[PDB]
Subunit: 396 residues, 4 copies
């Protein structure tokens, strides 16, 4: 059975310890979901939503069942079936895939998919607290690092594996900086031309002691571009002869995104306007250290599953820019036209809230197909552990 | 398409700070999965396993992508597609459901489902660590409590909501103690008669400083039964006129379980012997505080989805005994014969590792159908947030 | 027999998390001591210094032997006998007393006394860390509160006991506010007129990432006076019919002070200029909750020890203003002329680094005797636990 | 002028996380002090006690003013002048010295001196807690190490500097082990023969959950001697060609000791029996790394102050055995008869509660003079930072 997207929304993406600091991951998820629900008042929040599957990586200190909290906070009925999924950066795309599968199987007719992350408010852990440290120093671990940014097998940061990708595929410092700059320039242009306006819903920030309430309305990172400081930035993952910098890597970020999926049956009954159809998807994996070019494996699977014979049939691509090297390497391997890829800018400039980005790219991709006259789009996102997820959608 | 179970295995269930203390959640998951894989050497670990979906509630300090770690640790090929799912106590049953859906959709032919939990090794969190405490005392939160055992909406322990269930449905202290005692007695009898032998795989514990290696071979909790101490135990969630005790509630535990799912295509090609077919499933939810009797909502949905018209057609039931009141209340609402329910004992006596139990009940249910001459079995498990999942299987 | 002050110095007093936040208590002690040493080059740092006794309350994470570290960091020869003393707020005054005793007994001829405190860099403690928290929430204790500001017997803040003083002795909110305003205005005059110029030595703050170093030269708190906000400030220790506020209580602060004492023999042999003679001292205590007016017991003991028959003979008094009510109550009980008391301002306006203040008031008192033409001075300081220390000096 | 010891007492010395783990440093201090008080009922606890000076190294989480708390918990009148002193291991000996000085100056007539330490209940610190860790891993510091056992200047354990002593002074592994064995065997004889019976007062341990209270009556460490395991013990401070082990170094310990000092006037007026007179004292210091043999500088200073021309006049010596190498090196340098040194055993076998030991050795020394028929005794103790304190007593 066909699976349609009828609504999408996302919060603006906040910087680490930035504009969305006062909000939890669940709260941000609620904002995005309320934004999406408001677009489809045909669907009754009190009755028509069968299931929620929501992405989140850093669940520590969020409380029981983050997807359940998001749904209830958004005003959805408590009869909703809820579950939270973690595929690191792929989490929210996996939520969409799983939601699509549920509709295809006839277990649900209306599914909420998406993801949320507050990397700001992910806590520190004390492993030795329960049993005791006994004697000598002990460590407080940054959860962002342990469960989000470091490889589980060698303990190294994803950025170190980005440096591996640079060596393996011959991608230079200067190539990565150029990609980064363009990502920022495209993101800034898109902001100025209102390209994100339909997809973003603002976050209300409560006023502090006589201060008025404010709205966070735009992504925080794009305005931070400083070309000269970017081009001379220190390499943070490898000191000597490095290529990856804080400027050309994606930042640490807070955000959420929501997508509403329905079956053909509901689309009819409810007189909903379909925005796009999920044509298919593909997921692949290989060596954990090679996660950066895993999307190159996933995309052909997605295309085959979608019944797309020629990759040139695809009008636009979204490759989540976990690093500038990720954007470059997959375009290179697949021999794609760069002008069709991340045309509004990507994660290097927009930000990368891990649990959100898998859906965020789909949301932005749909906006691109809608606003730039595209029919077929592909979204792919790599993930820590050596994997990637990819999805094909077609605008209606 | 039909989805078959071809292999199941579980670790023994360890007590809090007990027999499995030296093992992480991932390590326990690897043990269960290796046990299951060994039973089906027809399936090549290096090639035939398309996807893993694995349950886990307390992911803090486990490292990136717990399901990915479990798969790789078990010797599965790194081309496997992996994701981790959290539906609190329902996590591992949800993993099975999602895996079944993936096979039905044709995205995968061989899926590993299951779950793992180390509640012993779940860490403490320091929410104030990142931004600073500034002045005055601050709190270190027990992750087991915050993300596992406390309701996200009112902050109260699940045991407090168990007391609510007792009031609402008129279930007494004495009724709950009787259920608990029987659960222990049945579990002990089952251990003595070797009823768990086919499903349990042992955990090797490394020797400490000249000590030899040991095996953890049986569930730790059943031997702790002391009827007199149970019947006079203090009520821990409500001091005065209480009903729920540490003895009649499920304990905090460590464990894992794995189930291998295949399509009809693979079953044929590989000449695999099918153990059971997944007939259907059902999930429901309502008020978070009413999670205890949510299985009573889920089971009828499961039966309908399975095409089962008469509930008396079901030979055995597994209702996860998160509390003794949970075992009682759902049997009562559904007007079931208690003699068909949790016949080998349940979580009150066996233990309740949250991320594992959803699959653990399915594994045990299959053993019951196999060993006691049953055809149709139902497994259901409640979860924090107000939900429940249920599954119908049929022995082949 | 006779004990002479030959040199004094103090750092500026920094605000909590303020201008001196980059320095440890030991570093501040070294600054003050180096300042004192530089004023008496007739005393050879490599030969002549027999002993150091140095006050400090919050010694956690300062490393072995704070007084020893201060002496060695200031360039004193490591043959010096070192010890650190804690009498809470009276610590640095007790250090002067003990140093004078050491000289009078003939055990030392040259003694460094004083004290230091960094309340900013006092750490949090985890009491359950060593043995383990086991299960459930555990508390991180703010060392400033546990060991500095809270009574050991009832656990209540010193400010709660300041309210008891206000009630017991009929000292109103308006009286305390008027006292605080006057303390700030005197402090502001002192800064404008350079009254602290001879006693204060600056602290160098290291520039970060290539930026130039800066100098902290004056006390941070006096400029913060806002009369209208002070008079409408919240009563922080008692909600209902309170009198004590953050504005009329002393703040939390960082700083250090040093005083160099010599015997009669050394004064002559080294041709030193005596600044003052320590005429005597007195210490007293009573109920812990009544610490606020313990100085009124200590001062008469000090006068007796100093052979001063009439309290009207004293030209100037320093009563450490732990709270405005402390300044008021001791003036009231001892029937003193307020124009003789804390004439350059006091701790309400200047700051109260616990381990420093007992010598800080002696430093300021001597400046007053020198610059205002006084002969006999009395310094007194209350301390948590129910005590006070007092000293009588005579300018030469 | 003359200062007399009229009473002494000590707690048993408990092992790290051992027999006294349920007590705070303050509680242990109170036990010791109560024991001392009970031996001199001619001194009225409600009237006669002018001052307490009490040693303690690790004051974190003890609450305001440890010495004050000890005096009040022991039932002394709250008019007492209280202060806490830290000279690391020499703390409690410095307290005796300062108390004697206070009496000699005529400021006090009756002084409590001594010290207490609970190294078990010294807490962990979180230095980044107040201001925040921001990003990445942060360390919880063991207070025992940071403020007790590690040098402030190089951060190295005292045991590393003990290896420097062994190398500098040609003191072998075998010599240190033989010394340790002898210390244990002397301690075991002392326990068998009741040599500590008069000085030790027991500690009551509260029974948990209805169980009866128990009594800690003897030092915990002496019974642990295992000669064969000691001689093959690992060198813990230096891996290659090491000499210092956990067995031949002093342990980490909990305990307290109290000594009551009086003036000549009080001795006569209250018809008190003098036990000993404090003949004199000496303190010295040099390079921090050379603290081990600082007692050999302090002792000659003490003898000079005491008017003792010939060191052969001393009947018995207590050199605190921080390490076996400390006992050996000071005996070697001062050319003493080993049969006069630590004749009941020393800290290697008895334990080394840092803040207690400086008075503990004086307590034991007096017992030795009394029970073995000695007249003149010398106690000496080294301390981290490069110093030592020494005292000369004469039995009356």
């Amino acid at each position: 059975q066909n699976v349609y997207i009828v609504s999408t929304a996302r919060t603006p993406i906040g910087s680490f310890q930035g504009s969305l600091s006062s909000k939890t991951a669940v709260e941000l998820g609620a904002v995005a979901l309320k934004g999406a629900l408001a677009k489809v008042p045909e669907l009754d929040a009190s009755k028509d939503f069968d299931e929620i599957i929501f992405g989140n990586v850093l669940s520590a200190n969020l409380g029981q069942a983050p997807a359940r909290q998001v749904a209830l906070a958004a005003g959805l009925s408590n009869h909703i079936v809820a579950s939270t999924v973690n595929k690191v950066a792929a989490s929210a795309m996996k939520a969409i895939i799983l939601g699509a599968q549920s509709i295809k199987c006839g277990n649900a007719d209306v599914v909420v998919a998406g993801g949320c992350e507050s990397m700001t408010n992910a806590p520190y852990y004390m492993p030795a607290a329960r049993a005791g440290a006994k004697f000598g120093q002990t460590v407080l671990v940054d959860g962002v690092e342990r469960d989000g940014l470091n490889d589980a097998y060698d303990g190294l940061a994803m950025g170190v594996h980005a440096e591996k990708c640079a060596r393996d595929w011959d991608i230079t410092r200067e190539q990565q900086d150029n990609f980064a700059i363009e990502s920022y320039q495209k993101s800034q242009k898109s902001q100025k031309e209102g390209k994100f306006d339909n997809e973003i819903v603002p976050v209300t920030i409560k006023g502090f002691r006589g201060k008025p309430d404010t709205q966070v309305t735009k992504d925080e990172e794009p305005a931070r571009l400083h070309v000269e400081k970017l081009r001379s930035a220190r390499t943070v993952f490898q000191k000597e002869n490095g290529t990856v910098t804080a400027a050309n890597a994606s930042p640490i970020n807070d955000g959420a995104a929501a997508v509403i999926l329905v079956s053909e049956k509901v689309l009819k009954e409810k007189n909903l306007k379909p925005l796009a159809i999920i044509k298919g998807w593909g997921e692949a994996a290989h060596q954990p250290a090679d996660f950066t070019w895993a999307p190159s494996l996933a995309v052909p699977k997605a295309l085959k599953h979608a019944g797309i014979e020629d990759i040139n049939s695809v009008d636009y691509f979204e490759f989540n820019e976990a690093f500038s090297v990720v954007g470059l390497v997959n375009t290179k391997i697949l021999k794609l036209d760069p002008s069709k890829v991340n045309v509004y800018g990507g994660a290097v400039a927009l930000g990368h809230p891990l649990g959100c980005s898998g859906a965020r790219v789909v949301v932005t991709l749909l906006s691109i197909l809608q606003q730039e006259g595209g029919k077929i789009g592909v979204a792919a996102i790599c993930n820590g552990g050596g994997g990637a997820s990819s999805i094909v959608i077609e605008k209606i």
